[PDB]
């Protein structure tokens, strides 16, 4: 069990721990969470009760170190930042602790939730999409833009996803154009699995990061990654079998986490009916489609 | 973006564009076979391009022999006709090749898009205009040559014959589409038109009459009569 402490809480604020989330009044003393289950990555994240725009959060794997937030009032956010100093770092975690001024991550232990959102999601993926290699952490805000986004403007904030592109060269080979374009096993399974992802861990991987970070923050490039990634399976004739039921389930539980007065602008009603219902995967996606259909049979 | 009414003109600026239409590009007849089922025969059809400034046409022949074992045959037209273009412009020595091509029907978009990628600077774009360019196989010179035709073939014609020798784009191109719609919308009679007076002929190397400028007003008159006409019966006004 692992602590991120908090040096004060100087503005209200909204904070999040992974699907929790408290609100923290000014200057009420709050001085970090507790009890964050080790084993996977999470996010910390914010929204300041007088902009209720603008969320952002760092991504972090206890693991990798012990980090802490801190209010900076020059920049006017909570920062993230690493305590390098291990011996100094147990001492502020026991003193706050001690005097329990601090928030218990609340985790059920039936509740294998974070753990299904976060399967594929590996802490050293997330840092070459989020370039910032003096830090072990990741920061992502609602405004960051993507690499694909940019082309169609600083580098130095921009979410590095896979550029996905099915009218592209690609995605389609010399002379099989019209095969190519409606069965995308090609562009799927050579160019993205075997090229680019390596395997279809880190495939799920960023298409779960994608569809956090389009949850948490509402990053709308977000969202368009997390939606191509999907369709480019759905479209595709030949899927290994164990891909596609991983889908299912992942989508199963992204579907379930979504608050459910945001399934307008998080939701794509033409990638979802057509992966549904069109697609050659139509038939392979029990589980999403079941609670898709009891949940949201408006967008569809 | 799309043609329409408003950027009308640009048609006739010096921009070398195209338009492309596939309607007559899977042509069938429809009949009962034996047992009482329903079975199509596919007939020989054609790609109609045409460069709209020039009376350029690209008539592509696409022989019935393309079919033979393929299925989602009216799907697969679309895309054997982005391959055509696509070939055609490669064809073109670079500073013939079109900077834009418009296509009557939205449908081929995303074919000719897929086939142009090696074109990126050519631009794919759609019409809101309702073209006549389907009743080009009402032009009998044209309908003939499809018909006759023994393998794939590219037999290029000038669709205005020589009209711009006295007439702007602009006009051979209104003069162009309203016979077509006349075609269209009755083709006995936009013929019977055509061709009343015997003693105007067609040029071995042109597709239409050799009318005299009079005679293309009364013409053109009688084409317009004949689309009115026509409108009143479709919706009894």
Known sequence: ?300 | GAMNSSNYAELFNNDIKLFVDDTNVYRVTVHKTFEGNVATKAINGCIFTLNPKTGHLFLKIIHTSVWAGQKRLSQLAKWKTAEEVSALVRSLPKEEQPKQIIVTRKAMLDPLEVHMLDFPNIAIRPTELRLPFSAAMSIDKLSDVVMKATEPQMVLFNIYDDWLDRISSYTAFSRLTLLLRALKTNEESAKMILLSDPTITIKSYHLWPSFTDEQWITIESQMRDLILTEYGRKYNV
């Open chain 1, 1 to 300: 069990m692992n602590t991120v402490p908090f040096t004060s809480a100087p503005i209200e604020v909204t904070i999040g721990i992974d699907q929790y989330s408290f609100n923290v009044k000014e200057n009420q003393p709050f001085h970090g969470i507790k009890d964050i289950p080790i084993g996977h990555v999470h996010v910390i994240h914010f929204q300041h009760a007088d902009n209720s725009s603008m969320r952002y959060g760092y991504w972090f794997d206890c693991r990798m170190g012990n980090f802490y937030i801190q209010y900076d009032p020059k920049d006017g956010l909570y920062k993230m930042m690493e305590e390098r100093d291990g011996a100094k770092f147990e001492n502020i975690v026991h003193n706050f602790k001690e005097r329990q001024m601090m928030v218990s991550y609340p985790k059920i232990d039936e509740d294998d939730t974070w753990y299904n959102l976060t399967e594929f999601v590996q802490m050293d993926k997330i840092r070459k999409i989020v370039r910032k290699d003096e830090n072990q952490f990741s920061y992502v805000d609602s405004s960051m833009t993507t690499v694909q986004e940019n082309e169609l403007s600083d580098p130095a904030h921009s979410l590095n996803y896979t550029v996905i592109n099915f009218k592209s060269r690609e995605a389609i080979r010399p002379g099989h154009e019209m095969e190519d374009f409606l069965d995308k096993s090609y562009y799927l399974n050579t160019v993205m699995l075997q090229g680019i992802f390596k395997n279809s861990s880190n495939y799920f991987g960023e298409l779960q990061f994608a569809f956090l970070n389009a949850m948490f923050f509402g990053n709308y490039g977000s969202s368009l990654q997390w939606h191509a990634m999907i369709e480019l399976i759905c479209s595709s004739a030949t899927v290994p079998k164990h891909m596609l039921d991983k889908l299912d389930e992942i989508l199963y539980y992204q579907i379930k986490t979504l608050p459910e007065q945001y399934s307008d602008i998080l939701l794509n009603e033409r990638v979802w009916n057509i992966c549904l219902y069109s697609s050659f995967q139509k038939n392979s996606l029990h589980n999403t489609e079941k609670i898709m259909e009891n949940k949201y049979p408006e967008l569809l």
